[PDB]
Design a protein around this motif. Sequence first.
Motif: not given
Lengths: 426, 426, 106
Positions: B278-281, B286-290, B333-337, B341-343
Amino acid sequence: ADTKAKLTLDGDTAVELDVLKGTLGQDVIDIRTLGSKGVFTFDPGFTSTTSCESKITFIDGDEGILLHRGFPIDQLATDSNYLEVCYILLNGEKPTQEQYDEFKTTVTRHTMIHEQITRLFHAFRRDSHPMAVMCGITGALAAFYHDSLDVNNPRHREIAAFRLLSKMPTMAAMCYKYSIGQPFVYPRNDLSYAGNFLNMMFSTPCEPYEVNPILERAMDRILILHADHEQNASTSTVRTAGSSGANPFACIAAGIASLWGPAHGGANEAALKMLEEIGKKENIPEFVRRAKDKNDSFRLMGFGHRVYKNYDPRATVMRETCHEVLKELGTKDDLLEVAMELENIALNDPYFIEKKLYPNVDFYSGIILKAMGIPSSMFTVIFAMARTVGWIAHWSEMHSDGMKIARPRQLYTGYEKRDFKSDIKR
Amino acid sequence: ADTKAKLTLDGDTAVELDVLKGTLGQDVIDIRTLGSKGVFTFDPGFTSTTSCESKITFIDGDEGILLHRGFPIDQLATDSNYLEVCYILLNGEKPTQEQYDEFKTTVTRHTMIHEQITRLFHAFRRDSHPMAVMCGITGALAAFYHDSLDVNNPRHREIAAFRLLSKMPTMAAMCYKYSIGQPFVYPRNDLSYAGNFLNMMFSTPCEPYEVNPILERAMDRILILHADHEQNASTSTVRTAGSSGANPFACIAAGIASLWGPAHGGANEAALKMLEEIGKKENIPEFVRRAKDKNDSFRLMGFGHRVYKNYDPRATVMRETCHEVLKELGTKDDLLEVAMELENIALNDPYFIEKKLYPNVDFYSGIILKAMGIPSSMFTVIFAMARTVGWIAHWSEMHSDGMKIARPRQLYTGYEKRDFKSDIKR
Amino acid sequence: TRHTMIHEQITRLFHAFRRDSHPMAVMCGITGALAAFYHDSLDVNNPRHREIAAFRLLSKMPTMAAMCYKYSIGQPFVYPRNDLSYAGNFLNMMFSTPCEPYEVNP
Ligand SMILES: O=C([O-])CC(=O)C(=O)O
Ligand SMILES: O=C([O-])CC(=O)C(=O)O
């Protein structure tokens, strides 16, 4: 069982350590707490350190004793069969009929190796050592059997085990056939584990091959007698790779290479030539070939042993099996007088007597296999093939333990922190 | 010698043991000869046992200290390059322009792999996992380069160490190419180590490949940061396999399989699945892989580390480089920002601050590799490729200590001798 | 029964496919290559031609389909046997291994 009570240690503070005991063998001092306290021992090689608890094999070297699940190696050799010994080693108890029936069906069920894996052999040189081809193929199985690699899954281990167990002989016989230029022979369900191996090793499509019940039982014994040997270099290697997460096939592949290690070891390796070559009943007999012994490489030729003091308990059944076979293969044994002669020099020469280079199990295994037309290069292959079940048991026991990834410490003696400034500009 | 002057083992008679001190780190207790007095310690897990003495790499977990032959990793990763660092780990000192140029010359002239081995590559399944093929190939090397398997012969050991250092990048790139169906690329004597590897990974006959300077440096740094990591599990396997005398290639193969190890389970890739799948903030987090993470699902994505307490000294420069790469590529890269958020999550999420799941060097390494266009199925192949020099140094050292035969003992708790009675059949 | 076997070279074609390919795609691939091996019966304007081409496809399709399956699971190919029925033979080529004589359930 007395002092087993406890005991303590102290350099600057007091620490109470328990004294554990085994069902056989000496006690051990549980230092499983000194670590936290901030105390660390120094034992390069783990000679005075016990790395695990095991219920598989027991060895009392000074007394020449070897037990697999309590059962003495001698009885298993003459009374059991390799497959049954496999069951016992992996399960911990002799199998009921129904239990052994299923165990044998499952094994017989997957002896074939994926045709693509078979394509791998053809990418090796025909001149390669069959032991190196054996490690190569075993270390590639993971690229073909990717569905049973998670060692954290019990079913996984179950499967990986049966795969290695059923396929190792098919693999070893292929190494041999590839080394001499003959076509591969598929596994047959109508034969015994030993009979089938001999079949895959010697049959050609030019005539139905018939296995001699004598040579067969002899092979079965060669196998049982090598099934497992407690902790040692190759088994410790299989245990370490295992607890590091490495998949089962990779673990066995490392075990096979560790087992081969002493052999392509040098001085060892060159004395290997001297034996397999010099032998014109002038050299060996009049202690001519043995007149040269700078490099010992004794156990390598089947003399002496590291653990057992006076004799290898496994050598009893094998020597009698050796006698038998040599007679079954009738009078075609001239050069093999050096066999009788070397044993004589091993038991009657003061040197060997003093240094105890007594014939161990492999001396006779080697004589048996030779009498069968099997080249020396295939000796370690067959031993590794047989030892695989033991590796599986130890590996399966290392997991079931506590999956505690072992991380030994180091005594750092190197350079203290120093700044870096390269002297190069390239 | 702080809280450790001298120590006394107490059972029924005081047994004084000599304490040893390192140039850095904790002091230890000597116990080599204990066994020679029927006294053995018990310690599965090696929580208190110091397996060896080493001068290669020093780590101070709580202080986040990592040194290679005395030099701070930060310093080496910034002002050096992979080859110079290999020279250091292997030789113990930084090279002279002459020693370096000599070393560099030897490496580049052994980079090509035997053509027969290329045939072995084509026997593996096209869908084979790159790491499995890498294990398959390395473990098969002993069958070919058979003139350097005598581990006790210093000439064979240097030749093997050099062959591995030269060929690993070559084999690693071929693992990638083969998986994507593009032709293999030959080494380029005129390119740097890192530039040569990028070219072997991404060049094509269709047109010339231009090695981006910033990417060339980013890769070299990734290599530098994974060159060695002291006494870890994979290094333990290498050293343990090497103690038995196993050939150089077999040991490195064991190290590779060991490094891949803790990544075979289902929840292993199932977790490191959505990490890129998945490549999207507002999607992966977001209340997912939590809680969508189940067994490890943290420690596999580059969060936390059992060696370091607060942070990973390797991540420092790796994070710096990350910026340079994203900056540089821009449209790669940019898409990949979704990283920031992970950090950010790992820096403020109470769950992460809780588990000390701080971003390690592999978090930032992965970002750079995901940015250069490298598939996640190559990450550990690259890490292992870089770690080989370290594996080689440790293997050598152990052999300098005289092939420290790692054969621990056991505490037997299985059956006592019992008679074997088989009433079954076959 | 006379021409169920496929030219050994056509058999070499299978080995050039991925083991992970869908057996249906391998089936279309091999069938679409037969012309490069059987170039003598391609003129559809010649009646004898059709006659031959027909028997070739008819006798060889099952040998081909069973090979797709064997290649997909990693087992060796099984040659056609004249002593079996069209259906029995197919089952045989689909399931038998060299490790034990296969017996077809009527
Ligand atoms: O030293 C040992 O225990 C290993 C041994 O004899 C064998 O592998 O046959
Ligand atoms: O966990 C360890 O100490 C090993 C490690 O990080 C590495 O190999 O980079």
